[PDB]
């Protein structure tokens, strides 16, 4: 299982590095725009924030196959081992094919259809990233869509993996993991809601209270 | 399958040693408080009660990652091979991470969510212990939660194992075992209700009665 | 839906009368033994405990048909409208039949089989009381048994109603209610865990904290 | 729901009359042969054994339509309101047509097929009696067949009712009742195992044990 | 529940009239050709073989809407109340429309699609007749096809009824009846297979045998 | 059940009027563009091809609420009783509420979400029209979406009805009808493939061939 | 089905009044605190934004039963017909009971358990408001919990209704409606996401494009 | 698969040895009482009835661990390779454990709970024998219990095997085998009901009848 | 998968040898009687129509184990490698055990019970042959029974295989194959209906019609 964060704030990334066993951080130009900082700064700083380990992900903006080819060349020049994710269109499939020919790992993003993601995987993307929240909000069923995509990948192209993103509530992440996703990423607020429970807090408080009422200190 | 006792009564565990194939005894500071005796006394006596065999478990109470690190150092000093369980918070995950770094086996306790247990397992905890009775009491469904946690473990983290606790009726234990739990623990009252059945007693009485009416004795 | 309490402590009954919309209180000779007080005292005081309202239930102890006949006569002499529960044996069936002939409402207790309860209902018992916790403890399935009993009653004897008892966790009561039970009774501890949730407490605390930080009062 | 007994022993019928709310007793020439006594003698005897109330059933033995017509005439001469059951063949359907024309109630026995029983019911039979134990013993599924027959009767001929027979264990009766059967009959051994439970006995025993431990007496 | 026969032999019809509660006899030009005799002869003879009561069905052979209009006029001239079935084409739907305009009951035959039968029913045909055996032989599934047809008729046009035909084994008839068919028809041999069971024969034989062994006589 | 056509060809409408029991014809501006003829001509001609009966539907083209109000006034001026279709946007809901205040029946089109259709139905649309084929083509599930919409309407807004459109194969229409749709519309090609089957043709051919081989003629 | 809004902005409420058929607006002290304006000022403004129609909801704040009694008195004094929501505790239960005694309609809020909401409904609350998003975030399952609550209400207390709240994604609202909720409330952003779809926008755009290509305008 | 017999009649065992591929015979002291013959006689004669092969099973009668120790010693002295069955109590588990220490194979009998049988298997008994008929008659579900026991064994203790006993009808044996039981034992009458079918007999009869019709004789 | 033919017409076997990949032909004395010719004449001719390959099957007629042993000896003397089929009785089981001791492969025929077939397979028959059509004709469920038989074989006796026979429609063969049968045999009529479809014929007709309309020839 691979755990990533969809954010670009260096301080939060470094702070949460000590908590979860991070496998890397994925970023999108929307989050980059939110952070306001230029990429040639954000990737180095975030890389140092995660201790120089893990994986990295960045997204191109071009519309023509050679255009996102050149964009991926720039990204690989900046960070040697980054994976370049590309929106899935006809040009997206093309860029995937020549990028796989060049041997640079690629990710399929903006996936709204199981057939679309399967086509991207056949073209050669090692990762496929459906937009769970957007698909769910647009009248679809992101959970079932992820299920079908996972089944198709496992039963035709084993080497491909599913990377779930676009989360708003912990439940969506729970169902995505239950569907067999090999990798997921989550935003900071959902991550915080993963590691806080009033029931857990009350249980710990009662636990310490009993220890205190018994032995007259708190420490072991 | 690993069977443990959720209690701290030396005489009780010694008496029940000849009945069930005990794999160890798990203790929590609440039960230790009920037993009123200090840990440095109860652990050696219990270890002798299992004849120097079986597994052992104790829990920290600190809030800071270094705090449960020091506590776990104390437990490993008292008992070399004892497994230390930690309440699952952000600090719990941190402590689990450096504990897996230093190579001390750990257990995840006070687990109320499948995602929480999955996070603990990814951090590296060897066992995950949800509170089935507490979850069911607080409007949740402990059985389905345990099933989901087991599925997530078998899917992403094969090396982790589920250790069910917090039982009030034999039905909960049976359901947890049917869910695929690799290890469970139970209290003395549930253990007693496990091995007693009026139907079994009546069948044995009728059986001996048949032998009596046949041969003039109940013997041989 | 009919809500009752299976206990005999006057103070607790009176205190909880202000909270739940009580329909009555059921008692059994085991609970009477626990309370240590004679019935001719406990029933009047309890009747005043919910102020002369609700329903009352008490159980016979004789084995012979005329035995619980005289018993039920004594209970009706003490409280005019009390409903008498009888254990379901052959003598129980005979007693239920001829008490239904006399026109005194009766209840079927100590029910361990759905067909047993159905036979009691055919004999004429107004209520049937399975022992869910004991059935689960003895390797059965109380929830499914209650389900079959409810289906059989709604199919053949519409006038009979299921009165669930013998609870240890609120989950059992939840499943019994979901099965279609028209009446349930529960003990004090399950009632207390029923109306308390740390999540609710934290939510209301944060709620009033926000309103306090906004305007500085504790009420409208 | 209609409860009957498939037996011919006057003493047992009278003894069990005080236990269950009997609706009558069904008889067949097999159990008549086992009882050894002639029908014209036994029939008034158990008729009085049920207190003179309830239903009665007896079977023909002829092979030709007019033959079992004459048999039914003899039975109606012996007792006015008895229901005549006939084995289901081509002659059975013809005899049932004649008997329905004469307005004498009839029952369909020896039913091994759902379609066969449905045809018998459409011919005018008020009752249909499959042989659950025999069908199960011959590699079929008595419970399934009863279910299909019940559904067919309900959704085509509402006036027909299913009368299950041929039982060896109480489970078969339980599933027949769960399938929606409006009437069942059972043998004496199944009745005795039906109304006896060691668990119930032990519960009652513990009950007056604690009553005695409280009040110096097992009595109220 | 309407029981019909799909045959054209006067002797067989009259013989089976006494056994099954016939609602009528359906005929098709194929079976009429097999019977070799002309319609103007056969229909009076079958109508008398009924005992004078029941329903009669015959089919047109024309292609043009007015053509089967004239055909249906001829059938109504021969037998006043006969119901005319028409093959379902575009011309079939047209013919059904003018026949519903003129108030002559009609039946939809040669139905291979549930939507086709729905269209016929909406056009106004009183009955719809799918060909179960042919549909099954041609790679379809007549059972589920009839199921969907029945569901559609019930939930859109309540007045239409399903009349299943084309049977080869009793199982097909059983599933058609279980699917909710209000009427079916049945060939002679498969009908014979409804009314013969070796198990029933052996049961009757043993029954008479034990009666004889007990009473030294065969008679009741 | 309401049967409609989604086309604007007068000749085809008139020709198919003799076959199916038409309840009306729905038109959309795309189909009007395909037909190339102006609306003030197409609606009168279609109405005359109707025989003067049935229902009519037309769709407005403005964006602002009073805009489609005025357009609906124009259409209702051309044909007195036409139902106005409106796209479901915020302005669509506004216009629907205004028209419901004016008491003119309205049509909800371009429904890609069950919640959107429910909102239109609450606003007052008499019918809701999802685009099954487009929802399918965009990675959704048109059949399941129609199912949820039908359930929601039957649950909360009994007066609303589902009008399925956008079909490419008769299978989609079959599933839509099975889901409980009270009205559907079909294109000409799907209608033609609907009422044609080679199996039916071959069955009719064999049928008249046998009639010929019997009587020297294929005629009655 | 009753549609409400959970917000406190007068401008947004009035703007959305023309779009959805609003049944009222619910407010909670958290949102009131966010608005920072006193309730006696805010709710007249909302009432006018309704056009003087619809329902209103406000929550009590004190702790003692008489405390929320006086609070509800104040709310009824300020707005005559306003419904009062109360957090569900023991005090909340008592408040609900005697408020039903003097006939003040009440709503059950802060519900985290189906049995808790069922108890509130038994106490007499007209509406029950579970917190779907919070329950899902805390390891539960809000959808299934709402399902059980709805089933229990329809089974035991028909007059009670479920009012879903706490939404973050359209799917939660869709599933709550599918579960049978009679009323829901909706935050502004999620409501906006109910009425915007890129698919619908593109369909409308192409629609005007073809009208343009046909008649030289997108108009008329 | 292992087939055994639960009986003690030498003649029947020898006679059935030629028919079924016997793997052994299990005996219980009740059956020994029925046979009235002493064990030191029945086991040698039964072994000779085997022809000198197969497995043998006998049960202890003592209540104290050393008591069944001595009993098992006597049985192993009598027949070297006999497997000892022990009733499952606390002393039962203690005995099972120490004979697993001594390397003598053991069987768990009188099993009424899946958890009980699983505990016996963990203690080490090679076989577990639930009482299907008794459990089923006492209001339980023998088939489901056997299924759960088999699932638990295959999940946690692969080496343990389920040995079903206590049968009354062939259906119970069929379901037990379908549940995955690796070994079953069945009584003489039920085994006879496995090897007789009237349908099979009629088929054989008709078969020789057609051979006779062909060749004037029933033989090849 | 093994494909066989249940017939004895040499001309038909020879003709169909070119079409299907025959694995052999099974014969029974019923179809032998139908062919009227003696076995010693027919079976060499069928072996020659085979092309000298495939498998052969024939049945005994004796009722005694030794008699059908002699029958099998005669068959093996005539044809070196023919497999002998024996009816499954007690004598059949004995004959199978002895024949397996002689190393001659055997088939169990006239199988009406899954337990019966499983017993034969344990006795040593290489194949098991149920009679699907007779079973479903006699009120059973041939498809389900074949399913259970296949499950039991794959569970306990891996070497046994299912050989389905007795077919009337291709649907039954389809379900038998779907159940996992490793071998099936079908009659000539079902084979002819199997490989013929009017839909296929019409598709081919349209196909070469289009080829002709394109290139002025139907040729390639």
Coordinates of C-alpha atoms in Angstrom, one line a residue, chain D residues 33-214:
Chain D
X33 CA -52.8 -50.9 11.1
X34 CA -50.2 -50.1 13.7
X35 CA -53.0 -49.5 16.2
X36 CA -54.5 -52.8 15.1
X37 CA -58.0 -51.8 15.9
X38 CA -60.9 -51.3 13.4
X39 CA -61.6 -47.8 12.2
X40 CA -65.3 -47.8 13.2
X41 CA -64.2 -48.6 16.8
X42 CA -61.2 -46.3 17.1
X43 CA -62.8 -43.2 15.5
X44 CA -65.5 -42.6 18.2
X45 CA -62.8 -43.4 20.8
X46 CA -60.3 -40.7 19.9
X47 CA -63.3 -38.4 18.9
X48 CA -64.2 -38.5 22.6
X49 CA -60.5 -38.3 23.6
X50 CA -60.4 -34.8 22.1
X51 CA -63.4 -33.9 24.2
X52 CA -65.7 -34.3 21.2
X53 CA -64.4 -31.2 19.4
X54 CA -61.9 -30.7 16.6
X55 CA -61.5 -32.1 13.2
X56 CA -61.0 -35.7 11.9
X57 CA -59.3 -37.2 8.9
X58 CA -59.3 -40.7 7.4
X59 CA -58.0 -42.1 4.1
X60 CA -59.6 -44.3 1.5
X61 CA -58.0 -47.4 0.1
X62 CA -59.9 -48.2 -3.1
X63 CA -58.5 -47.6 -6.6
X64 CA -61.5 -46.6 -8.7
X65 CA -63.2 -43.2 -8.6
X66 CA -66.5 -44.7 -7.6
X67 CA -64.7 -47.0 -5.2
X68 CA -63.3 -44.2 -3.1
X69 CA -66.6 -42.4 -3.5
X70 CA -68.2 -45.3 -1.7
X71 CA -65.4 -45.2 0.8
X72 CA -66.1 -41.6 1.5
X73 CA -69.8 -42.3 1.8
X74 CA -69.1 -44.9 4.4
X75 CA -66.9 -42.5 6.4
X76 CA -69.5 -39.8 6.3
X77 CA -72.1 -42.3 7.5
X78 CA -69.8 -43.3 10.4
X79 CA -69.1 -39.6 11.3
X80 CA -71.0 -36.7 9.7
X81 CA -68.2 -34.1 9.4
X82 CA -65.0 -36.1 8.7
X83 CA -62.8 -34.9 5.9
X84 CA -61.9 -37.7 3.4
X85 CA -58.3 -37.7 2.1
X86 CA -57.5 -39.5 -1.1
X87 CA -54.2 -40.4 -2.8
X88 CA -53.5 -38.3 -5.8
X89 CA -53.7 -40.2 -9.1
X90 CA -55.9 -39.8 -12.2
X91 CA -58.6 -41.7 -10.2
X92 CA -57.8 -39.3 -7.3
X93 CA -58.5 -36.2 -9.4
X94 CA -61.7 -37.8 -10.7
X95 CA -62.8 -38.8 -7.2
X96 CA -62.0 -35.3 -5.8
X97 CA -64.1 -33.7 -8.6
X98 CA -67.0 -35.9 -7.7
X99 CA -66.6 -35.3 -4.0
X100 CA -66.4 -31.5 -4.5
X101 CA -69.5 -31.8 -6.6
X102 CA -71.1 -33.6 -3.6
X103 CA -69.8 -30.8 -1.3
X104 CA -67.8 -33.1 1.1
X105 CA -64.5 -31.6 2.1
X106 CA -61.4 -33.5 0.8
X107 CA -57.7 -33.6 1.4
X108 CA -54.9 -34.4 -1.0
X109 CA -52.4 -36.9 0.4
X110 CA -49.3 -38.7 -0.9
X111 CA -48.2 -35.5 -2.7
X112 CA -44.6 -35.7 -4.0
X113 CA -44.7 -32.9 -6.5
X114 CA -45.7 -29.2 -6.2
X115 CA -47.5 -29.3 -9.6
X116 CA -49.3 -32.5 -8.4
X117 CA -50.5 -30.8 -5.3
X118 CA -51.5 -27.7 -7.2
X119 CA -53.6 -29.8 -9.6
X120 CA -55.2 -31.6 -6.7
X121 CA -56.1 -28.2 -5.1
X122 CA -57.5 -26.9 -8.3
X123 CA -59.6 -30.0 -8.6
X124 CA -61.5 -28.8 -5.5
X125 CA -59.4 -30.1 -2.6
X126 CA -59.4 -27.9 0.5
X127 CA -56.2 -29.5 1.9
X128 CA -53.0 -30.8 0.3
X129 CA -50.6 -32.9 2.3
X130 CA -47.0 -33.4 1.1
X131 CA -44.7 -36.1 2.6
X132 CA -41.8 -34.0 3.8
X133 CA -39.7 -36.8 5.3
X134 CA -40.2 -39.2 2.4
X135 CA -39.4 -36.5 -0.2
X136 CA -36.2 -35.6 1.7
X137 CA -35.3 -39.2 2.0
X138 CA -35.7 -39.8 -1.7
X139 CA -33.2 -37.1 -2.7
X140 CA -35.6 -34.3 -3.1
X141 CA -36.0 -31.1 -1.0
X142 CA -39.2 -31.3 1.2
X143 CA -38.8 -27.7 2.5
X144 CA -38.3 -26.3 -1.0
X145 CA -41.2 -28.2 -2.4
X146 CA -43.5 -27.1 0.5
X147 CA -42.4 -23.5 -0.2
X148 CA -43.2 -23.7 -3.9
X149 CA -46.6 -25.4 -3.2
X150 CA -47.5 -22.7 -0.6
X151 CA -46.6 -19.9 -3.0
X152 CA -48.6 -21.5 -5.9
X153 CA -51.6 -22.0 -3.6
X154 CA -51.5 -18.4 -2.3
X155 CA -51.1 -16.8 -5.7
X156 CA -53.6 -19.0 -7.7
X157 CA -56.1 -20.7 -5.3
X158 CA -56.3 -18.7 -2.0
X159 CA -58.9 -21.1 -0.5
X160 CA -56.5 -24.1 -0.5
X161 CA -54.3 -24.7 2.5
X162 CA -51.1 -26.7 3.1
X163 CA -51.2 -29.4 5.7
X164 CA -47.6 -30.6 6.3
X165 CA -47.1 -34.2 7.6
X166 CA -44.4 -36.9 7.7
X167 CA -42.0 -35.4 10.3
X168 CA -39.0 -36.9 12.0
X169 CA -37.3 -33.8 13.6
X170 CA -38.8 -30.6 14.9
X171 CA -36.6 -28.6 12.4
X172 CA -38.8 -29.9 9.5
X173 CA -41.9 -28.6 11.2
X174 CA -40.1 -25.3 12.0
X175 CA -39.2 -24.7 8.3
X176 CA -42.7 -25.8 7.2
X177 CA -44.3 -23.2 9.5
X178 CA -41.7 -20.6 8.3
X179 CA -42.7 -21.4 4.7
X180 CA -46.3 -20.2 5.5
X181 CA -48.1 -23.5 6.1
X182 CA -51.5 -22.9 7.6
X183 CA -51.7 -26.3 9.2
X184 CA -49.2 -29.0 10.3
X185 CA -49.5 -32.4 12.1
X186 CA -46.8 -34.1 14.1
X187 CA -46.0 -37.5 15.7
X188 CA -45.8 -38.1 19.4
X189 CA -42.0 -38.4 19.5
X190 CA -41.5 -35.1 17.7
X191 CA -44.1 -33.6 20.0
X192 CA -42.2 -34.8 23.1
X193 CA -38.8 -33.6 21.8
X194 CA -40.6 -30.4 20.9
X195 CA -41.8 -29.4 24.4
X196 CA -38.7 -30.5 26.3
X197 CA -35.4 -28.6 26.6
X198 CA -32.5 -29.3 29.0
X199 CA -31.6 -25.6 28.8
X200 CA -35.1 -24.6 29.9
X201 CA -35.0 -27.2 32.7
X202 CA -31.6 -25.9 33.9
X203 CA -32.8 -22.3 33.8
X204 CA -35.9 -23.2 35.9
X205 CA -33.6 -25.1 38.3
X206 CA -31.3 -22.2 38.8
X207 CA -34.4 -20.0 39.2
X208 CA -35.9 -21.7 42.2
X209 CA -32.3 -22.3 43.5
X210 CA -31.7 -18.6 43.8
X211 CA -35.3 -18.1 45.1
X212 CA -34.5 -20.6 47.9
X213 CA -31.2 -19.0 48.5
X214 CA -33.0 -15.7 49.0

